[PDB]
Amino acid sequence: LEKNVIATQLSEEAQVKLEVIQSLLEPCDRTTYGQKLREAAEKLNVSLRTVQRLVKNWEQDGLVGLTQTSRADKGKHRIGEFWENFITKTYKEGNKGSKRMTPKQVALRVEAKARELKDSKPPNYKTVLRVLAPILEKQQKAKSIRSPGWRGTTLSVKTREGKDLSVDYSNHVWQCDHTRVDVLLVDQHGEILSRPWLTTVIDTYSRCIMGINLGFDAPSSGVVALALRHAILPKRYGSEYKLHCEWGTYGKPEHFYTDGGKDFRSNHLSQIGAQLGFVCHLRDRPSEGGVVERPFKTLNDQLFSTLPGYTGSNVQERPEDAEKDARLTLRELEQLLVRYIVDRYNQSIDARMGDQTRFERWEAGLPTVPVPIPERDLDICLMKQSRRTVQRGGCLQFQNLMYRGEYLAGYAGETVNLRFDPRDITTILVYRQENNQEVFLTRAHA
Amino acid sequence: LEKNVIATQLSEEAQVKLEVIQSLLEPCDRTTYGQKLREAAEKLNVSLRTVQRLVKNWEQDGLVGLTQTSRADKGKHRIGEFWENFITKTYKEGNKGSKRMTPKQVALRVEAKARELKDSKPPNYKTVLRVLAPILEKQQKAKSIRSPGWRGTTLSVKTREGKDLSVDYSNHVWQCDHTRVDVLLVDQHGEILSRPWLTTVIDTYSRCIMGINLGFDAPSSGVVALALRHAILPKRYGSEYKLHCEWGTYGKPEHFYTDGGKDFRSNHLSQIGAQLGFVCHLRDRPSEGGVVERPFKTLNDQLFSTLPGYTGSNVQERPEDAEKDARLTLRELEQLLVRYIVDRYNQSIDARMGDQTRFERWEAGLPTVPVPIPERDLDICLMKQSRRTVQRGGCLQFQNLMYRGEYLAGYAGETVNLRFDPRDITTILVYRQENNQEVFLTRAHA
Amino acid sequence: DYSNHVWQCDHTRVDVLLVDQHGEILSRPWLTTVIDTYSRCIMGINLGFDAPSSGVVALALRHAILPKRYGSEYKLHCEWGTYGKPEHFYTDGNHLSQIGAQLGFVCHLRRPFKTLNDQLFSTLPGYTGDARLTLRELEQLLVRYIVDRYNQSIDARMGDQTRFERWEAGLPTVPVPIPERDLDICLMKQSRRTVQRGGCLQFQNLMYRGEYLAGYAGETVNLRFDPRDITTILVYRQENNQEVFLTRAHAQGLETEQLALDEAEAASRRLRTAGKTISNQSLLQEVVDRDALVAT
Amino acid sequence: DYSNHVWQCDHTRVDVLLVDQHGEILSRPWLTTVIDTYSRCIMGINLGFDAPSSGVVALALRHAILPKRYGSEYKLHCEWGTYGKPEHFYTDGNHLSQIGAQLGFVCHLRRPFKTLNDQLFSTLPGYTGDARLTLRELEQLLVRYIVDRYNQSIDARMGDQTRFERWEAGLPTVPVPIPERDLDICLMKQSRRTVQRGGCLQFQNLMYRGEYLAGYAGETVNLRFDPRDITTILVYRQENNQEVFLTRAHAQGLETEQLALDEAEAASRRLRTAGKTISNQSLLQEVVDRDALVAT
DNA sequence: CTAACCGTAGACCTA
DNA sequence: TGTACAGTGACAAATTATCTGTCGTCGGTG
DNA sequence: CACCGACGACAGATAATTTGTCACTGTACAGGCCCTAGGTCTACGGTTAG
DNA sequence: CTAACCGTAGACCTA
DNA sequence: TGTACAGTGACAAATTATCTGTCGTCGGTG
DNA sequence: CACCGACGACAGATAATTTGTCACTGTACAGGCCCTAGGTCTACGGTTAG
Ligand SMILES: [Mg+2]
Ligand SMILES: [Mg+2]
């Protein structure tokens, strides 16, 4: 586990020396050899002694001995040991915590100390810049290492618990997150509304987009449920969208792998998961799921940056014209996004491997033909309150309202479960426990 | 107004040609000359005909004729004129307004057009990158020109009106602005308060700091008045500030040159200006007054970035530790700022010229010894309401309160001027018009 | 005057058509050989697609110098027993003499092919003068001829001994093997690679993982490899005027069978076309133009 | 055999002490001269602080070649009437022959000083063998001697004519002046400057403003100047293998009197010296240490 | 006088 | 002619590890 | 015994390396990230029944 | 029925 | 082994302005 | 009249320049700037006096 330094290409002086050496390595009559030495000295024009060291030198170091030996004091400092360590220590403390230290400020601190110690010759500022150089430098690579990612066809992701979850087939693991769209919108009158949220559901195995929604509602369990609803049911669009291909994806995941923000660890989502039969998992760190996040950059690069009202990734680059130029409505932008996703994005070649389009990776990879879930079986995405008590006369207490309907009076005093739509609570679906089963009783009206 | 191309240093082949030429320029016996040509051809190993062009060539172009002539098609494009103009036009439109276009996207548009036109050979993406190159490039210099500034000892500034105002002596023109301090503060209990505003008054002639204040009150005419009060009266500090030098500046400006934000075009400031006798002027653009703004960067670089709770300079560089590390109070920070300004900043050498410290530039440059303005003559910084009417019985209407005091009853029905302190309105100073002079009558109590 | 006294190199275009892994037609290959002139015995070979200009011989020499150690797959019966430096090495006309010099023998500048033609090549599939033959197969055939026939043949100039036996017979001494690292002045190089976190490198669309390479995540290194087998690559650190050996790295995610450089390029160029195929018909173009029209 | 047939250059250290504008002592200067060997007449000179190594003679030659045109300040009575290329130019040992070549005369490699010693230098203030003498004053004295005495003297080798008169007498033809720009292969250069908005450049802490330079705000240019007078600088654009003259720029904010390069450097180092004296004996160091202690 | 009970509101955490 | 401090090329001076002679000594050879 | 090659003790000269000095130029100062919308989890004055 | 009058509040601009 | 698209070195192929011969013609000279 | 130097009409060879292809690598995706505190300027339901 060592050795083998192999010399770099030799320059002209060394080339001449090489030839001289080739002539002197070979033994012959001693006197003739002596003549060769004289000849060697004239070819080099140095001395009759020198060429003995030059050959001997070659004898041990080959081509390397013909390179220029470095001064071997390289990298050393000529200042006192105390000062070199003083500078290094000062700097390390200078940047500890939230504060920042500049090399120039360090040099001043050094000067101040030099005074205290009565040292007439502390290092100059230029020297401090040189002493800290390697420290400032390593950092520049340290913050910029490029991970290899995965080589393809095989992958897994970690959970907060440290569990490894495989991704073996289409609709095995789905992921979801939220971002903002970097476009300002206007209404039908030209009045500006703040940019909308974009929520995506992505199929981990194929990297095909499963369903999206965008609009002005802040992230919530409600938003997630709406996003899932789109990702789960069969899709269809009208002729106004000017589509060439159909967006063909639907099904149900086994795992829901997403972030740890409250929108995803809610009782509402848990109820959804229990009723649909899938399990939630949380990321260990932002760098752990990159496939979910990534596509947001390609939307900025291929679509949104070409639209009027585009802002920017950061406020450092926000175009000054960004607030005045917007003319698009939410309806128009959504149409654009759908056509983009359907006839371009899901039509591209998988980046990891081969000649499969994203859409095709997904279809070839799905074990069975999915059975559409009836739209009416998505009522499970409605919220369930774990309890209200039915009052005498058959009315039940809810959100500052009483509800009544068929049966209820005969069940007064019972504790019941209420399924309702957060968007419209005109009626409520009432369930009761029968052998620990949740069984429907009635639909009550406000 | 032309000519004079002078060649760059010649390489080895040309050096040989040069020598050949030196021999052939000189005429001699025709036959001998002929011999020289033969010799010239052998030295170059080319032909007996070549060296006639080489000399002739030298005859017109001297050393330049010995350089390699460029291909002279350099910079040209081999694609059709239609496409080159198409690419340039597309790009210019692609970035008009708030949107952005990438060269990649342009190349695609080109391809799309090529299809429409049935052109089997449009330029490749690599070519588009090369065609737009000079356009992307010029911009990089265009956004980065460094202004020369002024050469020293002479200066003037423009107003919005286009008027040139000279800066001839100390306390001729003062400037003032507002920034934030990039340090979070805590109270005496460790609880965090948002970073404070810093307001400065700077002497334009000397660039010495005339007075400062910092704290949590948002910019207002009130803040400005407080800032001026400090800049105008003689300064003094206690031993707890651990100062070596006294901060010696005071006086009164002739011009108040500042920004156009509302804090500076208020009736309150106008009243101050009228009573103290100085005139306000507004900047034409942020780049017009740089001397007022500038010093804020040096505070970040020499002082604030070394303190705990430092919050960078933007949102891109904000240290993650910035919110938790803060431990300084407003009182402590102010003490630090004062010692910094007094024994370091105003002690530095003027940047424009010579061996004068900032403090000295100011003192040598002040025409006369200032006379301190009595502290009691700063009552003029109190606000004056142009009118209230005195009611029968001698009470006057104010801010939802009535005030009364000596005299007033005998003046009922008169319109009067009210001077009051926005911070404490327990009493009011009442003035009346006497021959268009504002004359004090009385001090009224709530 | 003795075995390994003088070596001579030779080269030709080989007029056998090769066909790739996907049935695609390849251009004709080059063959370079190194021979010991005392008994006319073949020391080492190099078969590939690159012209015997500057390169190739450097690798053929290395092949000659180092022990042979061929696998079961070549179905050899006889051992190819040579190794070791000659006193003189003749090649067909600087770096060639630097190799000589760093190793210990004199380099000089300036015909087995007659028998390969008659006894092997003119009889193979694809002979240019319909059928398929890969490069790996051809090289197996070539070495089988050289180790078990050519060098085992008795020449008309001797009659007593085979070309190898006379080679053996003429050795004035027992040659001693040179540690391989001493030969790292021949192997082909890539000029720059960056170490990826964890200690990994990319070469020809394969990933390699190094031993103790991890401490250098983020630094530039350069590397050397034998085109006949790129499963392990030699990594060097760049010092002023010297390539200083740092470590070895192994290919990952590939098949068990050892991979050659020509084979890697072929797989990669097989994907590029596969990508160039689908493209976008009306699809992309239509979307872009419509996007612009709707915006206006 | 005729006037301007052969020119000869010569150089020495001049043992006169010079003192600067602020009374500071300077080291001894170099003098280089160019002489016409037909009548021993002085063609041009160069007085300064740089060694006659590579440079200086290039400027002395230019001085010899170009018309002289001296001002009222030198209090000259006689006209220094020479200008023009010789057939041969001898200097004391590439770029020197490139100058010859671009201009038209042959360059060769290999004693007025005897008379400067006796008739001027040994008699001046500061003679090293207490008193002050600036460089500008010395050069005025030197040219006064050369134009009105040396070249006006009749030599012992002639008796009939003065050194200049014989020079005149020996001209086979009327020389014709060469446009000055043709001499821009001698002037000293700075390698890079950036054009500031509006068309301005900095050189030696002076600002210069160019004619039509404004269109290049932001680009790199390089520049040439005569050390004896830096009030106008020649700006060149950098083309492949050529410096192509772009424009002229004038100094601004300086005094009316023409400024030389040595004088600019002197003013600037005086300003630096002054800055290095105020200091922070305790004002800054104390604050820094206290800042740290209070933070802790 | 004493105990049980759904709707507002506050403390806290996270994307 | 917007502004002033931190960082950076280009070069001179001081210190030193290393190369070069000249000579002496030991070993191999005639 | 004498001549030539290899090695060393020693002194002296020499470029390589580091340190210090000086002039020319890039880039932030120009109101600005701690705030906001969810969710869980729990406390609770008021209300009602015994 | 009719006219005059200080304190809240809304529209708008800027750093 | 987080991720996948825009931008970039290194090199081969096609097109062309420009350099090189060979010869013919005109002018200067012997 | 014959020999040598300068110029040109012409064809042919040749590197320079541009264009196209392919493999290796930097960097944003990771909730996030339209909101906020002043001031001027004016409208105004309610209140009060005639
Ligand atoms: Mg999230
Ligand atoms: Mg402002």
PDB file of C-alpha atoms in Angstrom, chain A residues 77-251:
ATOM      1  CA  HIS A  77       6.207  29.662   7.832  1.00  0.00           C
ATOM      2  CA  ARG A  78       9.115  31.757   8.978  1.00  0.00           C
ATOM      3  CA  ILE A  79       7.214  33.570  11.721  1.00  0.00           C
ATOM      4  CA  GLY A  80       7.254  32.349  15.291  1.00  0.00           C
ATOM      5  CA  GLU A  81       5.224  29.285  16.281  1.00  0.00           C
ATOM      6  CA  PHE A  82       3.352  31.340  18.842  1.00  0.00           C
ATOM      7  CA  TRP A  83       1.989  33.697  16.159  1.00  0.00           C
ATOM      8  CA  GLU A  84       1.001  31.038  13.651  1.00  0.00           C
ATOM      9  CA  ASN A  85      -1.066  29.297  16.281  1.00  0.00           C
ATOM     10  CA  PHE A  86      -2.372  32.543  17.591  1.00  0.00           C
ATOM     11  CA  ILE A  87      -3.715  33.492  14.121  1.00  0.00           C
ATOM     12  CA  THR A  88      -5.323  30.052  13.549  1.00  0.00           C
ATOM     13  CA  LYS A  89      -6.937  30.046  17.013  1.00  0.00           C
ATOM     14  CA  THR A  90      -8.229  33.608  16.678  1.00  0.00           C
ATOM     15  CA  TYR A  91      -9.879  32.945  13.395  1.00  0.00           C
ATOM     16  CA  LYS A  92     -11.636  29.720  14.603  1.00  0.00           C
ATOM     17  CA  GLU A  93     -13.111  31.668  17.535  1.00  0.00           C
ATOM     18  CA  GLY A  94     -13.861  34.652  15.344  1.00  0.00           C
ATOM     19  CA  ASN A  95     -16.373  32.645  13.347  1.00  0.00           C
ATOM     20  CA  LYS A  96     -17.848  30.540  16.104  1.00  0.00           C
ATOM     21  CA  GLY A  97     -21.571  30.935  16.437  1.00  0.00           C
ATOM     22  CA  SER A  98     -23.614  33.537  14.623  1.00  0.00           C
ATOM     23  CA  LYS A  99     -20.846  36.090  14.115  1.00  0.00           C
ATOM     24  CA  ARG A 100     -18.335  36.563  11.318  1.00  0.00           C
ATOM     25  CA  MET A 101     -14.675  37.468  11.330  1.00  0.00           C
ATOM     26  CA  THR A 102     -12.665  38.785   8.425  1.00  0.00           C
ATOM     27  CA  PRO A 103      -8.961  38.046   7.953  1.00  0.00           C
ATOM     28  CA  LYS A 104      -8.324  41.785   8.157  1.00  0.00           C
ATOM     29  CA  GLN A 105      -9.889  41.992  11.609  1.00  0.00           C
ATOM     30  CA  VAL A 106      -7.749  39.053  12.671  1.00  0.00           C
ATOM     31  CA  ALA A 107      -4.602  40.798  11.573  1.00  0.00           C
ATOM     32  CA  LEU A 108      -5.596  43.763  13.731  1.00  0.00           C
ATOM     33  CA  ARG A 109      -6.155  41.536  16.762  1.00  0.00           C
ATOM     34  CA  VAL A 110      -2.685  40.162  16.163  1.00  0.00           C
ATOM     35  CA  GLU A 111      -1.267  43.644  16.125  1.00  0.00           C
ATOM     36  CA  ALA A 112      -3.028  44.463  19.393  1.00  0.00           C
ATOM     37  CA  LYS A 113      -1.494  41.422  21.041  1.00  0.00           C
ATOM     38  CA  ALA A 114       1.867  42.218  19.604  1.00  0.00           C
ATOM     39  CA  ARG A 115       1.711  45.531  21.458  1.00  0.00           C
ATOM     40  CA  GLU A 116       0.811  43.873  24.761  1.00  0.00           C
ATOM     41  CA  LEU A 117       3.744  41.509  24.370  1.00  0.00           C
ATOM     42  CA  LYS A 118       6.111  44.239  23.178  1.00  0.00           C
ATOM     43  CA  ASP A 119       6.820  42.289  20.016  1.00  0.00           C
ATOM     44  CA  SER A 120       8.364  44.599  17.476  1.00  0.00           C
ATOM     45  CA  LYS A 121       7.836  42.150  14.566  1.00  0.00           C
ATOM     46  CA  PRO A 122       4.368  40.563  14.369  1.00  0.00           C
ATOM     47  CA  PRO A 123       3.249  39.253  10.990  1.00  0.00           C
ATOM     48  CA  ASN A 124       1.936  41.733   8.416  1.00  0.00           C
ATOM     49  CA  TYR A 125      -1.655  41.618   7.152  1.00  0.00           C
ATOM     50  CA  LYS A 126      -0.493  40.130   3.909  1.00  0.00           C
ATOM     51  CA  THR A 127       0.974  37.287   5.894  1.00  0.00           C
ATOM     52  CA  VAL A 128      -2.284  36.654   7.745  1.00  0.00           C
ATOM     53  CA  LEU A 129      -4.075  36.362   4.455  1.00  0.00           C
ATOM     54  CA  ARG A 130      -1.571  33.681   3.475  1.00  0.00           C
ATOM     55  CA  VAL A 131      -1.664  31.783   6.786  1.00  0.00           C
ATOM     56  CA  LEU A 132      -5.477  31.458   6.776  1.00  0.00           C
ATOM     57  CA  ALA A 133      -5.531  30.620   3.098  1.00  0.00           C
ATOM     58  CA  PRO A 134      -5.821  26.853   3.406  1.00  0.00           C
ATOM     59  CA  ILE A 135      -8.587  27.279   5.956  1.00  0.00           C
ATOM     60  CA  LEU A 136     -10.696  29.548   3.761  1.00  0.00           C
ATOM     61  CA  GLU A 137     -10.027  27.264   0.887  1.00  0.00           C
ATOM     62  CA  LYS A 138     -11.066  23.853   2.160  1.00  0.00           C
ATOM     63  CA  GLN A 139     -14.381  25.206   2.877  1.00  0.00           C
ATOM     64  CA  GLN A 140     -15.016  25.941  -0.687  1.00  0.00           C
ATOM     65  CA  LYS A 141     -14.931  22.329  -1.663  1.00  0.00           C
ATOM     66  CA  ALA A 142     -16.601  21.237   1.555  1.00  0.00           C
ATOM     67  CA  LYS A 143     -19.735  23.178   0.784  1.00  0.00           C
ATOM     68  CA  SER A 144     -19.744  21.958  -2.823  1.00  0.00           C
ATOM     69  CA  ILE A 145     -19.463  18.138  -3.015  1.00  0.00           C
ATOM     70  CA  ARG A 146     -21.757  16.618  -5.649  1.00  0.00           C
ATOM     71  CA  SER A 147     -23.466  13.425  -4.494  1.00  0.00           C
ATOM     72  CA  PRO A 148     -23.474  10.504  -6.927  1.00  0.00           C
ATOM     73  CA  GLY A 149     -27.172   9.763  -6.475  1.00  0.00           C
ATOM     74  CA  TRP A 150     -28.219   6.258  -7.473  1.00  0.00           C
ATOM     75  CA  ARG A 151     -27.032   4.313 -10.510  1.00  0.00           C
ATOM     76  CA  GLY A 152     -30.463   3.182 -11.591  1.00  0.00           C
ATOM     77  CA  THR A 153     -33.023   0.371 -11.511  1.00  0.00           C
ATOM     78  CA  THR A 154     -32.605  -0.135  -7.767  1.00  0.00           C
ATOM     79  CA  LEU A 155     -33.702   2.231  -5.011  1.00  0.00           C
ATOM     80  CA  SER A 156     -34.831   2.692  -1.478  1.00  0.00           C
ATOM     81  CA  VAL A 157     -35.627   5.553   0.899  1.00  0.00           C
ATOM     82  CA  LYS A 158     -35.186   5.970   4.631  1.00  0.00           C
ATOM     83  CA  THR A 159     -37.796   6.973   7.186  1.00  0.00           C
ATOM     84  CA  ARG A 160     -37.317   8.998  10.360  1.00  0.00           C
ATOM     85  CA  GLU A 161     -37.365   5.681  12.222  1.00  0.00           C
ATOM     86  CA  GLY A 162     -34.328   4.541  10.218  1.00  0.00           C
ATOM     87  CA  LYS A 163     -36.345   1.979   8.317  1.00  0.00           C
ATOM     88  CA  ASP A 164     -35.422   1.217   4.695  1.00  0.00           C
ATOM     89  CA  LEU A 165     -38.388   1.107   2.371  1.00  0.00           C
ATOM     90  CA  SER A 166     -38.006  -0.497  -1.060  1.00  0.00           C
ATOM     91  CA  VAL A 167     -39.576   0.967  -4.206  1.00  0.00           C
ATOM     92  CA  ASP A 168     -40.475  -2.086  -6.281  1.00  0.00           C
ATOM     93  CA  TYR A 169     -43.258  -1.188  -8.661  1.00  0.00           C
ATOM     94  CA  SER A 170     -45.644   1.427 -10.018  1.00  0.00           C
ATOM     95  CA  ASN A 171     -47.957   2.784  -7.325  1.00  0.00           C
ATOM     96  CA  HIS A 172     -45.817   1.260  -4.627  1.00  0.00           C
ATOM     97  CA  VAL A 173     -44.711   4.526  -3.084  1.00  0.00           C
ATOM     98  CA  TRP A 174     -46.180   7.949  -3.784  1.00  0.00           C
ATOM     99  CA  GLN A 175     -44.807  11.279  -2.589  1.00  0.00           C
ATOM    100  CA  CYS A 176     -46.306  14.667  -2.126  1.00  0.00           C
ATOM    101  CA  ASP A 177     -45.186  18.214  -1.305  1.00  0.00           C
ATOM    102  CA  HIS A 178     -46.077  21.854  -1.534  1.00  0.00           C
ATOM    103  CA  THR A 179     -44.449  24.852  -3.218  1.00  0.00           C
ATOM    104  CA  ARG A 180     -45.278  28.219  -4.522  1.00  0.00           C
ATOM    105  CA  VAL A 181     -45.754  29.057  -8.220  1.00  0.00           C
ATOM    106  CA  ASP A 182     -43.452  31.965  -9.209  1.00  0.00           C
ATOM    107  CA  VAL A 183     -46.155  33.749 -11.216  1.00  0.00           C
ATOM    108  CA  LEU A 184     -48.505  36.482 -10.015  1.00  0.00           C
ATOM    109  CA  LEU A 185     -52.106  36.204 -11.125  1.00  0.00           C
ATOM    110  CA  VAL A 186     -54.893  38.634 -11.866  1.00  0.00           C
ATOM    111  CA  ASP A 187     -58.632  38.166 -11.780  1.00  0.00           C
ATOM    112  CA  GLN A 188     -61.027  38.699 -14.684  1.00  0.00           C
ATOM    113  CA  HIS A 189     -60.760  42.446 -14.040  1.00  0.00           C
ATOM    114  CA  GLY A 190     -56.986  42.938 -14.095  1.00  0.00           C
ATOM    115  CA  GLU A 191     -56.631  43.070 -10.303  1.00  0.00           C
ATOM    116  CA  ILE A 192     -53.597  41.237  -8.832  1.00  0.00           C
ATOM    117  CA  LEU A 193     -53.874  38.223  -6.494  1.00  0.00           C
ATOM    118  CA  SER A 194     -50.879  36.734  -4.685  1.00  0.00           C
ATOM    119  CA  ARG A 195     -49.230  33.752  -6.355  1.00  0.00           C
ATOM    120  CA  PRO A 196     -50.818  30.333  -5.707  1.00  0.00           C
ATOM    121  CA  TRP A 197     -49.672  27.169  -4.030  1.00  0.00           C
ATOM    122  CA  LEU A 198     -48.840  24.128  -6.092  1.00  0.00           C
ATOM    123  CA  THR A 199     -49.312  20.639  -4.752  1.00  0.00           C
ATOM    124  CA  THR A 200     -48.068  17.569  -6.545  1.00  0.00           C
ATOM    125  CA  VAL A 201     -48.346  13.796  -6.144  1.00  0.00           C
ATOM    126  CA  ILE A 202     -45.470  11.907  -7.742  1.00  0.00           C
ATOM    127  CA  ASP A 203     -44.985   8.201  -8.365  1.00  0.00           C
ATOM    128  CA  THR A 204     -41.661   7.220  -6.905  1.00  0.00           C
ATOM    129  CA  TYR A 205     -41.030   4.203  -9.032  1.00  0.00           C
ATOM    130  CA  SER A 206     -41.589   5.850 -12.372  1.00  0.00           C
ATOM    131  CA  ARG A 207     -41.231   9.602 -11.596  1.00  0.00           C
ATOM    132  CA  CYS A 208     -44.415  10.194 -13.567  1.00  0.00           C
ATOM    133  CA  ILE A 209     -46.761  12.885 -12.219  1.00  0.00           C
ATOM    134  CA  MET A 210     -49.845  11.353 -10.689  1.00  0.00           C
ATOM    135  CA  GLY A 211     -52.033  14.405 -10.064  1.00  0.00           C
ATOM    136  CA  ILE A 212     -51.764  18.128  -9.331  1.00  0.00           C
ATOM    137  CA  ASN A 213     -53.774  21.084  -8.062  1.00  0.00           C
ATOM    138  CA  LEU A 214     -52.940  24.759  -7.790  1.00  0.00           C
ATOM    139  CA  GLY A 215     -54.765  27.757  -6.296  1.00  0.00           C
ATOM    140  CA  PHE A 216     -54.836  30.217  -3.410  1.00  0.00           C
ATOM    141  CA  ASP A 217     -55.677  27.979  -0.444  1.00  0.00           C
ATOM    142  CA  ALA A 218     -52.904  27.629   2.052  1.00  0.00           C
ATOM    143  CA  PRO A 219     -51.617  24.104   2.759  1.00  0.00           C
ATOM    144  CA  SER A 220     -53.920  21.989   4.913  1.00  0.00           C
ATOM    145  CA  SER A 221     -55.198  18.471   5.385  1.00  0.00           C
ATOM    146  CA  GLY A 222     -58.021  19.645   3.180  1.00  0.00           C
ATOM    147  CA  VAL A 223     -55.649  20.575   0.375  1.00  0.00           C
ATOM    148  CA  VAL A 224     -53.930  17.222   0.625  1.00  0.00           C
ATOM    149  CA  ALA A 225     -57.229  15.365   0.412  1.00  0.00           C
ATOM    150  CA  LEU A 226     -58.175  17.315  -2.672  1.00  0.00           C
ATOM    151  CA  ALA A 227     -54.808  16.571  -4.230  1.00  0.00           C
ATOM    152  CA  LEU A 228     -55.178  12.841  -3.539  1.00  0.00           C
ATOM    153  CA  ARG A 229     -58.658  12.808  -4.994  1.00  0.00           C
ATOM    154  CA  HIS A 230     -57.279  13.975  -8.328  1.00  0.00           C
ATOM    155  CA  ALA A 231     -54.326  11.570  -8.231  1.00  0.00           C
ATOM    156  CA  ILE A 232     -56.662   8.618  -7.452  1.00  0.00           C
ATOM    157  CA  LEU A 233     -59.629   8.894  -9.868  1.00  0.00           C
ATOM    158  CA  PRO A 234     -59.486   8.495 -13.672  1.00  0.00           C
ATOM    159  CA  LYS A 235     -58.747  11.756 -15.456  1.00  0.00           C
ATOM    160  CA  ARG A 236     -60.580  13.491 -18.316  1.00  0.00           C
ATOM    161  CA  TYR A 237     -60.384  16.881 -20.029  1.00  0.00           C
ATOM    162  CA  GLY A 238     -62.395  18.916 -22.509  1.00  0.00           C
ATOM    163  CA  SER A 239     -61.418  20.048 -26.007  1.00  0.00           C
ATOM    164  CA  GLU A 240     -60.588  23.588 -24.859  1.00  0.00           C
ATOM    165  CA  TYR A 241     -57.326  22.170 -23.376  1.00  0.00           C
ATOM    166  CA  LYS A 242     -56.043  21.388 -26.893  1.00  0.00           C
ATOM    167  CA  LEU A 243     -54.448  18.098 -25.746  1.00  0.00           C
ATOM    168  CA  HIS A 244     -52.798  15.445 -28.030  1.00  0.00           C
ATOM    169  CA  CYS A 245     -52.380  12.713 -25.455  1.00  0.00           C
ATOM    170  CA  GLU A 246     -54.575  11.483 -22.653  1.00  0.00           C
ATOM    171  CA  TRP A 247     -53.141  11.643 -19.164  1.00  0.00           C
ATOM    172  CA  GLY A 248     -53.623   7.985 -18.282  1.00  0.00           C
ATOM    173  CA  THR A 249     -52.774   7.548 -14.607  1.00  0.00           C
ATOM    174  CA  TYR A 250     -54.847   6.257 -11.668  1.00  0.00           C
ATOM    175  CA  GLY A 251     -54.747   3.737  -8.808  1.00  0.00           C
TER     176      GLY A 251
END
